[PDB]
Ligand binder design. Structure first.
Ligand SMILES: [Zn+2]
Ligand SMILES: [Zn+2]
Lengths: 72, 170
């Protein structure tokens, strides 16, 4: 994933929370999906993914620790 | 086709037949500690949740991440199940491995009606998780502000409570 500074469409929304962005807001692009910084985080612990690595379970994204604890 | 799958899917007749054999342990968790009740709550299977509870399932069971059934019902927005669990004495401020309570998840996922119901039933808004984040601060602003207002008018103190448990300071 990459950090960007938003200057996009008025219609643009965060893939996780569906809220919009502010001009110049620091956001994250993961595989073409845009996120607030506080939204590109693990669904279980709410923290940033170490080294950007996440694991999906039913459309939610988890860090290695929480994926291994709950779903692996 | 085990009991855990039947609970996830809401296969009521199969769950009922399985429970009829009293040699089966209705509290036993799967490979990651999810009980029948955890799965039925997580997936919104109201009739199966009720059947489990009324046949004696323990309400405060914990999976490998120390989530309770109420964490899962709240996280996945199943409003009626939240209410049923609270009626049967679920701990509204139960704490998982990260120090998160059910309200953290209702807030994070914008389950506004669940979050409001939790505060109306006394769920504390000011209790930090292990990383210093209070549950209401996982919400988007309109909900975040509303829950603090509702909590104040229900007689909560808004002072931030840093995380503590018996093992926190050795
Ligand atoms: Zn967002
Ligand atoms: Zn995590």
């Amino acid at each position: 994933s990459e950090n960007l500074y938003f200057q996009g469409s008025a219609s643009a929304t965060c893939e996780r929370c569906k809220g919009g962005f502010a001009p110049a807001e620091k956001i994250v692009n993961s595989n073409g999906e845009l996120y607030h910084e506080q939204c590109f985080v693990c669904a279980q612990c709410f923290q940033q993914f170490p080294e950007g690595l996440f694991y999906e379970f039913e459309g939610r994204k988890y860090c290695e620790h929480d994926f291994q604890m709950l779903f692996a | 086709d085990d009991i855990f799958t039947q609970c996830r899917e809401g296969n009521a007749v199969a769950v009922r037949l399985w429970l009829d054999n009293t040699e089966n342990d209705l509290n036993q968790g799967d490979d990651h500690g999810f009980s029948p009740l955890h799965w039925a709550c997580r997936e919104g299977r109201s009739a199966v949740v009720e059947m489990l509870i009324m046949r004696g399932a323990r309400i405060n069971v914990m999976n490998r991440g120390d989530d309770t059934p109420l964490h899962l019902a709240a996280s996945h927005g199943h409003r009626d199940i939240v209410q049923k669990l609270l009626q049967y004495k679920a701990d509204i401020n139960a704490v998982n491995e990260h120090g998160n309570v059910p309200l953290h998840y209702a807030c994070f996922w914008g389950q506004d009606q669940v979050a409001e119901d939790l505060v109306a039933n006394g769920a504390l808004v000011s209790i930090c998780n292990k990383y210093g984040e209070m549950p209401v601060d996982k919400a988007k602003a309109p909900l975040r502000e509303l829950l603090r207002e509702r909590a104040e008018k229900m007689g909560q103190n808004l002072n931030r409570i840093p995380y503590k448990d018996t093992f926190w300071k050795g």
